[PDB]
Amino acid sequence: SYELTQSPSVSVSPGQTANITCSGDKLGDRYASWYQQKPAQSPVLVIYQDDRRPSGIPERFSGSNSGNTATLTISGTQGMDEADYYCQAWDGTTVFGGGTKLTVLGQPKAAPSVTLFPPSSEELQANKATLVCLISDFYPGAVTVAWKADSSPVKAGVETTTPSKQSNNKYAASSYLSLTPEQWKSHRSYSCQVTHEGSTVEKTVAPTE
Amino acid sequence: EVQLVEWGAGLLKPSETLSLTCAVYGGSFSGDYWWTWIRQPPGKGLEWIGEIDHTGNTNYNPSLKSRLTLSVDMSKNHFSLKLTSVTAADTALYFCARQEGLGYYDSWGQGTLVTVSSASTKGPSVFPLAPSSKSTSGGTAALGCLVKDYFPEPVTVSWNSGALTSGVHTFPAVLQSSGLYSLSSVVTVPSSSLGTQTYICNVNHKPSNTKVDKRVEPKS
Ligand SMILES: *[C@@H]1O[C@H](CO)[C@@H](O)[C@H](O)[C@H]1NC(C)=O
Incomplete structure (x- = not known):
């Protein structure tokens, strides 16, 4: 099974150059293409065959495929370039990267506040268990959430919202971990770990609380 | 093209x-x-x-x-x-x-x-989120209600029948793989109030004709 890796979020100041990268084994042997996707809209081809630009795509978009990394370079980034960017590699078969959200900074960065609630005694009496991880006041509107059982990444049970804009123009998101009561009570702790702009906040709860 | x-x-x-x-x-x-x-x-x-x-x-x-x-x-x-x-x-x-x-x-x-209608009209389960001071500013605590597994949108949440508005943050719902929604509403209140002020979240799910008023007590 073949895999292209891209980072989920990149931010750039207006007018600066944004680099969006995509890596995969022997990606240099494959032809890379890039798609720009704005909300509720069809992806738009911005680079194909590693470094070719369709007619009508601005010259500030360029691409390269070297060192087994495909890179989309946007020089002089403009507000209108804010979007999700997908790489794609083709050798006869098609694989897409997971997408990168590019934020063109319109205000200073704001780090998330994280509140984590354990399952309530009432829900455990109903034979269920939900951990609640609430994430607020962050900008860019992009976070990664990872849950841990003791120190191990969970394999299942996570539901996480896309970030939504708050009244104050920062963003909020929430993530829920569903467990059996037996899973909750048989570990020393569970953790919600939130990554934003390369910094991480981890909150942890324990059944003895 | x-x-x-x-x-x-x-x-x-x-x-x-x-x-x-x-x-x-x-x-x-x-x-x-x-x-x-x-x-x-x-x-x-x-x-x-x-x-x-x-x-x-x-x-x-x-x-x-x-x-x-x-x-x-x-x-x-x-x-x-x-x-x-x-x-x-x-x-x-x-x-x-x-x-x-x-x-x-x-x-x-x-x-x-x-959009796949796997689910049908379903009222929420409501669970209290008992107060915690770990993530809040000094002298305050956050408490809330978990509004679990309802369909379709929307639900509304008030606190103390609308008398309590300051410090309330009701989060957008998650649409789970089950096809049901869940959301959480949290309010930050003075820690000194916890033993004397009652906190109740008023949950209304009109599509299922369900109302829940959930008392959120400190836990010991
Ligand atoms: C972007 O990536 C290219 C390689 O494709 C590199 O030559 C260039 O220096 C990078 N620029 C920035 C601003 O990261």
Whole structure:
């Protein structure tokens, strides 16, 4: 099974150059293409065959495929370039990267506040268990959430919202971990770990609380 | 480039088979093009589903290759999709697209949303989120209500019958893989109040005619 890796979020100041990268084994042997996707809209081809630009795509978009990394370079980034960017590699078969959200900074960065609630005694009496991880006041509107059982990444049970804009123009998101009561009570702790702009906040709860 | 126009009903119940179609203007069903379907679950990335050429050869993504059939009506420059044994997990924005020479998708349809009504009207369970001072400013605590597994939207949440508005943050709901919604409402209050002020979240789910007033007590 073949895999292209891209980072989920990149931010750039207006007018600066944004680099969006995509890596995969022997990606240099494959032809890379890039798609720009704005909300509720069809992806738009911005680079194909590693470094070719369709007619009508601005010259500030360029691409390269070297060192087994495909890179989309946007020089002089403009507000209108804010979007999700997908790489794609083709050798006869098609694989897409997971997408990168590019934020063109319109205000200073704001780090998330994280509140984590354990399952309530009432829900455990109903034979269920939900951990609640609430994430607020962050900008860019992009976070990664990872849950841990003791120190191990969970394999299942996570539901996480896309970030939504708050009244104050920062963003909020929430993530829920569903467990059996037996899973909750048989570990020393569970953790919600939130990554934003390369910094991480981890909150942890324990059944003895 | 060519123009791709997809139609199809989006609203469909689960365990069934999904069917859509796409129409092509300015091109021809010849040469090396691969007529392609790609889908995008909400909040997620693009997932290549499958391709068909003008002769009718197909390639499907192994994850569903058993359950997916593509077809072409070469006469009217149409191609179509059929997916068997579906779920809410097939909820996604579905795009038709044309793959050109060296493996790039030059032309895309507008997308069609496949919202799958797996669920029916269901009122929420409401659980108290007992107060915690660990993540709040000095002298305050955060408490809330978990509003779990309801359908459809919306629910409303007030606190103390609307007397308590300062410091309330009701978060947008998550749409779970089950097809049901959950959300949380939290309020930050003075820690000194916890032994004397009663906190009740008023949850109203009009679609199911359900109301819950949940008392949120400190725990010891
Ligand atoms: C972007 O990546 C290219 C390589 O593709 C590199 O030459 C260039 O220096 C990078 N620029 C920035 C601003 O990261």
